[PDB]
Design a protein around this nucleic acid. Structure first.
Lengths: 150, 370, 150, 370
RNA sequence: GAAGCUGAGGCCAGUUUGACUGGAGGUGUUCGCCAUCUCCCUCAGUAAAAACUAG
DNA sequence: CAAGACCAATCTTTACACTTGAGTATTAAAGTTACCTATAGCGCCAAGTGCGCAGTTTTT
DNA sequence: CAAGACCAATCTTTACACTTGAGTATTAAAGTTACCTATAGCGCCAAGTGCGCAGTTTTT
RNA sequence: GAAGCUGAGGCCAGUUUGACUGGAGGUGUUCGCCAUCUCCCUCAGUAAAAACUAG
């Protein structure tokens, strides 16, 4: 897969919405703009803030919360299979390992590293964008290199 | 549209018949007297129970049903709210790498009635209910409030065990929910609250939740409305926390998703009960030894039959317990299936335990007919 | 007068610029867009944030400062003369006094109030908009009624 | 474009001729030895002065002129910066209603040389200046650094009185300038700094600057690079503050502009000098009693004439003092005219004082020719 | 360990039989020598940066 | 004593290596960078024109 | 013990009063608000269809 | 004053000549009874809300 989940909390017309189990073709139907255009706006805003574009923050569904969160879970299993292999010693694979997969495999010990390698594992990378009440934006990963690579 | 209860709303929908005489005779609705309130003692805690026959119980229940349920709340409050649960209270912290857990000392006893009046005032019309003697808001507070005879110094007190105490606590604490949520979010910390128990998690790599500064700041925020932090229950840990049995673990760093499982302490009682049922030790011993449920002789409804009555009651208690624990574990399973945050090996163990419980329940229901 | 001063610190192409002594006709000349359009953008942004419009924050001149400030000084002498008089007991004059001129005359004593009344005084109202590094905006006066009335 | 000094830059523009021998012979540039440094004592403070004849003085002066002046700084640093002044350090606080003033204990003595190297590293190329023995950055730090013979424990130390110490202090403290500026601005507080003296002002109506929390937070921020707050110089006040003579006052609340004036303590010496000059007390007594300037007998340049020399020297000292104080007061007047923040009655008093000073200066210059 | 801070002495006043502490008053005040109005000598030693030379 | 919050650049943008479709241990070359600067009042020297290198306040 | 940070609405938008151009002590009417709701499983009663009002875990 | 917290008793073990403290072990660990693997009785008294009835 490519995207495991998208979660929006307290933004536009979304109270707490989680979308997952994405298939190869996703057909969106229903009454017009009851959240279709809102979901599109959420995704576009997240991907505009990913590339450090200065875009206006989204509105809150209810002002009785201080923040609104958009969480994207990327499925990086295939990229881990791409880079962890010995053959591909290229610069791009090396950079991808140093950025996305390090600082998560460093903490592990030998036994857990072996268990992760040998098992039919699935690897995920979760990135959360939080909008505070005063228009500030906070990421759950503070490295801009990670955001640009994603 | 914001809810607004006025005189007609109280007369028709809320009072109905409970306070018809007091509203037609223009006599002030009185305080909940000590005669209507019984005082149970549970350990060091004291619980206040109102009699159902009193009109105060009816008006309180209808107040919960129609008025308190419509006032908006904060999303960090996961307790006593429509759709909230403990698992929902633990879920947002799977993304965190360090965990901190704080408690509020005597949450319900420290809720000042003045704060309750200030919180409920905008949602209640500023009218006179009875002539020019008693206000509508004061009558509703009479419905919700109480004076503890044990402690007359505080006067008005919101007691535990009433109909309306939890929701009123949530509404009055929405202010601190907002303040603490704003502070934690500006610090990058995920915050959630269940009753008086606050859980914070830092997903980044930092010692913020371990420093005394964080505790000092949360105490400073709580001091605005007069609350205090219970320092005996303050917990801070890295990469895993065992909160009252529920274990959250997240070893990874950037972009890692933790797992929520149950420690062996939680599973201890149910595993022992299943083993005892497999051991064919009688139902009376199973109920008494592990579940602490028993049929007191003074509680026998009828003297027509005793031994068969006790056998049926113990069988009912066992079937109820097994159904309840099965329901709890499927609550966990559904939470996993909808959020995908529970440990996979723990999921397998849960499935095995569930199959054992269902086999035992089938055996019990089959032996019922023999 | 109407506006006594406009001060911009560390925004767009402005390092620390103060404009004052505004006359009835102000002619702006110079090389094209060396700060003309930037001054227009600053004024438009300040007046859009005055009316609580969601507009994008301005960029920093240099990122070695945490904030950029825009300070507007309004000359409210004539409005004080308008409202402090006894004859005009209308609702609008009363609201203007309660919003703009109270909380600044309450602190004063009788002698200083008399001195301010009798002297040929000039009254000013200073409002500062601060943009932090994380796009948040802070006002030196936290009452939105003051901003809307201004 | 960020400045970048490389080997050719050091050889041509900086070293010039001061270290020609050391650069052609490939011999390492040596530390500033104790022979080149004299130690003056001013109260409890010790000042380090390098001899002008040493090449270290020349390279330090050219380092100030060409390299340190190009590295960007933070706008909150109003000291030792092109265009900065004390009045500019006080000006942004006229809008504040409460004031707080903090000091850093031994600012220059607590500047670690490791922090200096880390700060200056990105602006200096990572090359080898002399073979593979000494680096270019280490040679430049040799130029700027020193080891105090009084305190050998700290090794490298930036001493007061050197050519490059103030600018290097500003560059190394830019990090804390940014951190404190961000914190104060997120709290709504106007912050400015002059050397080690930090001034904060809150324009809103709040007790933030008076609580211990603010001092604790500023101390916590300073602790990152090892600094400390001098608790003897901590000041907090409302509606006016008298900072070292300069008085800021702002009684109003929402949207008020304060006034900066000078207390009578600052004007005391100049008023007394003008009164003494009007009293026709001689110039020697005026210089000795109030100004503490005197001509020591060992400082007589030539023995050809003494009494006329002393009269001319005292006249020169008096004319210089009057010109200097007049220059200070017109600095105040220009600051007012450009910012419009000085008290009007104080402006009138300044104008009268200035006219008196000019009349006295004209009288002195006229009596010179008699 | 919390440093508080100041250069070394020679009269005179206040506290001391024999040595230590200050050398306009008024007024208000957040009590800070903080603000505002009016009216002791000697000898050392004194680094650097920055602003300012009314209009 | 003791600690969370430990600048912003540093040239920038794009990007697979191996044997042609799948892959289980750690950045970089390259096109553009892409253009910079000696020496401002004082001293040396031709010898009074022209060229080379004794203040205030605040921190303290 | 002790404190800075003490929600977000509450209907909303516009706006001079006095005698027609200048003025030195404290919000509001009004048009639209502009539309809302009794009573969800259990008990009473017609008497088995229809109408009115003995669990788990967590806080504790 | 910092409360820490628990319902009241009746054996047996450990500390006490006469009354007080616990009733699987292993392993690791942030030492928290925290996590993971394997395998004492009686009598009181028990308010409210919320989630959950696999698939």
């Amino acid at each position: 897969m490519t995207i495991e989940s998208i979660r929006v909390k307290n933004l536009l017309s979304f109270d707490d919405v989680i979308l997952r189990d994405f298939r190869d073709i996703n057909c969106i139907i229903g009454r017009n703009n009851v959240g279709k255009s809102n979901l599109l706006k959420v995704i576009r805003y997240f991907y505009a803030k990913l590339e450090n574009k200065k875009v206006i923050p989204l509105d809150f569904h209810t002002n009785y919360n201080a923040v609104g969160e958009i969480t994207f879970t990327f499925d990086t299993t295939r990229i881990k299979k791409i880079v962890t292999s010995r053959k591909n010693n290229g610069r791009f694979h090396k950079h991808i390992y140093n950025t996305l997969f390090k600082s998560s495999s460093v903490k592990l010990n030998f036994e857990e590293l072996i268990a992760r390698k040998n098992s039919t594992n699935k690897s995920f990378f979760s990135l959360t964008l939080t909008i505070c009440k005063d228009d500030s934006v906070m990421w759950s990963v503070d490295d801009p290199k990670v955001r640009s690579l994603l | 549209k914001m809810i607004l209860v006025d005189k007609v709303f109280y007369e028709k929908i809320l009072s109905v018949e409970s306070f018809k005489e007091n509203i037609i005779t223009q006599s002030a609705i009185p305080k909940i007297s000590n005669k209507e309130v019984r005082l149970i003692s549970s350990g060091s805690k004291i619980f206040y129970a109102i009699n159902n026959t009193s009109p105060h119980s009816h008006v309180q229940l209808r107040l919960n049903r129609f008025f308190l349920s419509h006032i908006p709340l904060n999303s960090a409050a996961k307790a006593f709210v429509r759709g909230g649960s403990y698992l929902k209270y633990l879920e947002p912290h799977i993304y965190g790498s360090s965990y901190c857990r704080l408690d509020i000392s005597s949450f319900f006893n420290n809720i000042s009635f003045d704060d309750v009046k200030q919180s409920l005032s905008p949602y209640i019309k500023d009218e006179y209910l009875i002539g020019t003697e008693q206000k509508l808001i004061d009558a509703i507070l009479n419905s919700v409030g109480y004076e503890s005879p044990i402690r007359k110094d505080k006067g008005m007190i919101i007691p535990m065990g009433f109909r309306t105490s939890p929701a009123i606590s949530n509404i009055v604490f929405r202010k601190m929910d907002l303040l603490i949520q704003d502070f934690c979010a500006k610090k990058g910390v995920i915050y959630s609250r269940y009753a008086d128990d606050m859980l914070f998690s830092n997903p980044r790599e930092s010692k913020l939740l371990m420093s005394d500064y964080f505790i000092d700041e949360i105490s400073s925020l709580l001091s605005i409305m007069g609350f205090n932090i219970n320092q005996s229950k303050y917990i801070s840990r890295e990469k895993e926390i065992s909160i009252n049995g529920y274990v959250i673990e997240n070893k990874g760093g950037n972009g890692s998703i933790g797992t929520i499982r149950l420690s062996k302490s939680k599973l201890n009682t149910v595993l022992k009960v299943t083993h005892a049922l497999a051991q064919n030790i009688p139902y009376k011993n199973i109920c008494n030894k592990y579940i602490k449920v028993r049929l007191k002789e003074k509680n026998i409804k009828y003297e027509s039959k005793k031994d068969e009555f006790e056998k049926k009651y113990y069988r009912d208690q066992l079937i109820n317990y097994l159904g309840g624990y099965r329901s709890y574990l499927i609550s966990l399973v559904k939470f996993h299936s909808e959020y995908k945050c529970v440990n996979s090996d723990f999921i397998i163990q849960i499935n095995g335990i569930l199959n054992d419980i269902q086999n035992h329940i089938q055996k019990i229901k089959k032996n019922r007919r023999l």
